[PDB]
Design a protein around this nucleic acid. Sequence first.
DNA 1: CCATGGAGTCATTTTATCTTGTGTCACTTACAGAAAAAGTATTACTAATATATGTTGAAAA
Lengths: 50, 522, 50
Amino acid sequence: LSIDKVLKKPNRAMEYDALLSINVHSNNITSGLNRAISTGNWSLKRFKME
Amino acid sequence: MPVCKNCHGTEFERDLSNANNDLVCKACGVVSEDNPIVSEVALESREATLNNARRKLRAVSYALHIPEYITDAAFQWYKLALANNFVQGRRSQNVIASCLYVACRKEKTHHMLIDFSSRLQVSVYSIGATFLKMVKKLHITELPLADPSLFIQHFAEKLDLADKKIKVVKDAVKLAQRMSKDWMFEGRRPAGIAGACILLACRMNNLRRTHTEIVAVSHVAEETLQQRLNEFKNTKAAKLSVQKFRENDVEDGEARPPSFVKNRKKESGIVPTLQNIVATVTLGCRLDLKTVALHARNAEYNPKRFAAVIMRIREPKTTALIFASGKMVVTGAKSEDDSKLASRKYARIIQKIGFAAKFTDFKIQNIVGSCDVKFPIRLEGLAFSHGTFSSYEPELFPGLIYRMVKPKIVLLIFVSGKIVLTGAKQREEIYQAFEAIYPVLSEFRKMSGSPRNLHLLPTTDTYLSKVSDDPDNLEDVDDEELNAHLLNEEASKLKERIWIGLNADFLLEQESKRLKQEADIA
Amino acid sequence: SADAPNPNNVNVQTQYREAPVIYRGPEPSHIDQVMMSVSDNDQALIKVLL
DNA sequence: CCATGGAGTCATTTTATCTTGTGTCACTTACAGAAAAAGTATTACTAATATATGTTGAAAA
Ligand SMILES: [Zn+2]
């Protein structure tokens, strides 16, 4: 999704790596993991079992 | 807050000892609260946009490693700037950007606008522009003046190396401090001089770290870096003290920033000067910019580029302007004797070639002026004092922005003391503002004098009267060179042949959509 | 502080509600090691042990 | 005028369902997109300033 809001609007030639947004987009992997291991409620939608 | 119903006591102690939790006053003994009851355990256009602002806010928030704190600090600023509707039509990033920015500025932390953009492809101007605009549409304090003494911390973090850098830190700090004191700090992009200090103290601690390796975190130019460096090499007691002992020498010596040193390179009682004056004139009739573009010496017309025609002259070296509606702007006028003079003259092509086009609604839209006090100025405390009426941004532009409402003029300021002044419709207002603020200039100095009379030269309307105000006096003031500024018919034939030659694609889609007008009903 | 700040302060951030935490216990005790530090988000952190 | 056929009502199971399940501390941590409106960024002008920036290149060692 966050790769697309660059690519909706053809602003000049769009490349500019689109990468450095990943830090913007991170800690869903970290903080989401901390909060998990501290609280101990594991939300798994992939197996639909929590 | 209540009172003893007996002793009329004004002060209470809760008593937590015996697990009654009484509430009683020293002079009464009567309780007040026994039994201390104590607790335990959608769709709107504006509110939704506030939630979105939260999301784009959090997103950019930790990315720069900023406090969870400062974000909800700045989110409020966004809510505020929404009230004046400054945030409506401008690219959302540039808004959430500065709105997040000024916050961590006020807290005096390390974050930087140049650093702040690279989250985007954008230019550290557009963001800077929007930023400085929301400074106008709100009213903001002086506090956010950053120094390198803050940035050298975080810049030191990514330098790798070892514990020695902390030593280097103090080695750098007192360095930069003296550099601020030695007077060649002002009016420069802070992150650069910070990196310069780091390169120095690092070399002072005898390590090898390349310039590239420095600017990676410093986000400045190599050339800039060593330029500010070599600017440091020749400074006071630079040679003599550059050895050990670090610096126990706090002695400033002299102070000579390159600002007025270049004033020596080409080398009150000094009057501000008139650079240009902007005005307007209405011709009262609409013409064809294409048709007028046919015969002129000074003309260019490309609605694909700009919808109007260029008009200029060699003397008195004026441009002014022309519109399609038959109005115009006046530029290139150093005085009023030149302006209404030229303002009438540009109508001589028209009334010679084009429509009736009389001379109407002549008023100065702005006047430009500049001068120099010939001594240095300390801005860092200037705005820190007068930033109610002033603003100083090291990053964007070197000098200081001053806002005077009385009279209403913006005063552009520099280190050398050269002062450019405009945003005035009146020549007297210039000497008014310059006069009144000059005591602030004499107030801030480091170690002419007499204003004489406040008004010396004749007024503006005198020089406006020195030119005929009657819209029908033209041929009399016709330079006779404009009689020669008409090109012949053939020059318009082949010259227009070139114009349309290149413009048949622009007028192509123009008239093509003019056909789509028929396609509308279809 | 918890209220909504504005770009207006003439002087005071001042007025404080002091809410000291008290040691409510059945027996006298001693304070030995008292730590001052700051977490990753840069906010003062005080931890004392009795 | 009577045995028959057909249906109408009326017990009777067996399936689908829901309320419970010893007590007390002591901590614990509304979808998305569409259109309308508002406003703005260029898009030229001087015109002073003073850094940055790049390049380059020229000039010197
Ligand atoms: Zn009482």
